[PDB]
Amino acid sequence: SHMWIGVISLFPEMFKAITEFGVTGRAVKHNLLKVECWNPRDFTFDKHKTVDDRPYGGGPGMLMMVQPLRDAIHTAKAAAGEGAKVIYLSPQGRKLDQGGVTELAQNQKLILVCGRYEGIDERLIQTEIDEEWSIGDYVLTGGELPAMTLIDAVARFIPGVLDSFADGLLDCPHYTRPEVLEGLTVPPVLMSGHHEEIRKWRLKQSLQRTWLRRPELLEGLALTDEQRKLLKEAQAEHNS
Amino acid sequence: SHMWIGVISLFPEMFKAITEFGVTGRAVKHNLLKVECWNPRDFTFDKHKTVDDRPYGGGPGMLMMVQPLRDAIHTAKAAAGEGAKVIYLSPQGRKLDQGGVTELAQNQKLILVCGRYEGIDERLIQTEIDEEWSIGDYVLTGGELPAMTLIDAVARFIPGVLDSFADGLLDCPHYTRPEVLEGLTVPPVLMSGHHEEIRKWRLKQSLQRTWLRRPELLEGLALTDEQRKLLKEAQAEHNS
Numbered sequence A, B: 001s002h003m004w005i006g007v008i009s010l011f012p013e014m015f016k017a018i019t020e021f022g023v024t025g026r027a028v029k030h031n032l033l034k035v036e037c038w039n040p041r042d043f044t045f046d047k048h049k050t051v052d053d054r055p056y057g058g059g060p061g062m063l064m065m066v067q068p069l070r071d072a073i074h075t076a077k078a079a080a081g082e083g084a085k086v087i088y089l090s091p092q093g094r095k096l097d098q099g100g101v102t103e104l105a106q107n108q109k110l111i112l113v114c115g116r117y118e119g120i121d122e123r124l125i126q127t128e129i130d131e132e133w134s135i136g137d138y139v140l141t142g143g144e145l146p147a148m149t150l151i152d153a154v155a156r157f158i159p160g161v162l163d164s165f166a167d168g169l170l171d172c173p174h175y176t177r178p179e180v181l182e183g184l185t186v187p188p189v190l191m192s193g194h195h196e197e198i199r200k201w202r203l204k205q206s207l208q209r210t211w212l213r214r215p216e217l218l219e220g221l222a223l224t225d226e227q228r229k230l231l232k233e234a235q236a237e238h239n240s
């Protein structure tokens, strides 16, 4: 299947980072993922193509100018046609996690609005935006990196395009050549050829790492009997 | 002051998204921020410049090949000289938040290692990496977008380069022209010219929004007396 993403951005060339390189670049070249961009600057009418505006109430910073941004959004909505969810990237939005990625990946079309400066007029959020999403509790200069983050995370769910959080757990450690690196050996179980011992080792590692690093993640999980056993074993070894 | 960031990446051209555009692009052009990249592919010796390798233990996926990546890291460390903290971007790392951004922005030099495929050998993390950092609880195809996210967030703290989370709170809504948009008016207080009423309105909005959207964030805060009062007022209005 295929996903279409419309993007509204003052810096559409930023999106080459995902459309020209790696797994996502190959998805775009093979038409599994389509990304189309509209730039508010192209919707300005004044001589200097002004895309910012002063905030009412004074104070510092500038906002994106309403008219060019609104017009861009309307053009993208017309292109997307029916059924396209419009998302504004913002640190005030729903914090993205793998559950949220799986929800978003159920959409065949999304339009992603990328802010710049201090953001966008609150009434455009009310009138044009369906959902606000954050990539994390930190502030960036623009919504393009968050949009690309979202695109990359969802694109991994597109069939044909290709884990931590997959089953709620951090990933296990991985090893490749050489067998010994600075005196550190690959765990012998991984060279044993024993698929079931390997499976159990990787799962116990994931449990152990999640417990030590992110114990709060473990709370939200309903572990299988095997997972409970392997976790107890890891905790007992840690104590020992 | 100035920050130097060394990056290890198979796709260094991705970083044009931050070095050529917007506030971060201007920081780079003005030498406030320097980003230097090393590509493991340039450290290969075989005819086809192989940069991946098979994981011990079978199963799917590939890892970054150890030797080219190790060699790249060593070249970057030599360039950074003394005092450079080496960070691996990974969903198994410390989850980035504004507190973590402020900590990271205290470094004059960082080297950021970007994984691809299923990641990197665990022993390289032990032998070469100082800290592991995640941008969020979701899985991406590569560490370049996370690295750029980190770079952008920290660059905002570089003097001369230029909020939500700043004082622990979500940002207030902002408004710009026109005064009426699809029947929605700018709050009159913001046109009143009264700086103190405006200050209080924006703070009460931040409190209200944080309470409604992210009540867990409010718990971690020690509110001022004024903030407690404004929050109580907002809650009373919400009830009314």
Ligand SMILES: Nc1ncnc2c1ncn2[C@@H]1O[C@H](C[C@@H](N)CC[C@H](N)C(=O)O)[C@@H](O)[C@H]1O
Residues within 6 Å of the ligand: A088, A089, A090, A091, A092, A113, A114, A115, A116, A117, A118, A119, A120, A133, A134, A135, A136, A137, A138, A139, A140, A141, A142, A143, A144, A146, B163, B164, B165, B171
């Ligand atoms: N964590 C984030 N998640 C999603 N988008 C973000 C994030 N941080 C910044 N942005 C984008 O960057 C744009 C410009 C920001 N400097 C505005 C920040 C705004 N003053 C705030 O603190 O909420 C915002 O309009 C968003 O589109």
Ligand SMILES: Nc1ncnc2c1ncn2[C@@H]1O[C@H](C[C@@H](N)CC[C@H](N)C(=O)O)[C@@H](O)[C@H]1O
Residues within 6 Å of the ligand: A163, A164, A165, A171, B088, B089, B090, B091, B092, B113, B114, B115, B116, B117, B118, B119, B120, B133, B134, B135, B136, B137, B138, B139, B140, B141, B142, B143, B144, B146
């Ligand atoms: N949330 C994230 N934060 C930081 N780096 C990430 C994140 N997600 C993916 N990456 C980078 O993307 C690379 C390739 C990933 N597909 C590997 C994921 C690994 N299998 C895991 O689940 O932990 C990783 O080596 C990281 O460098």
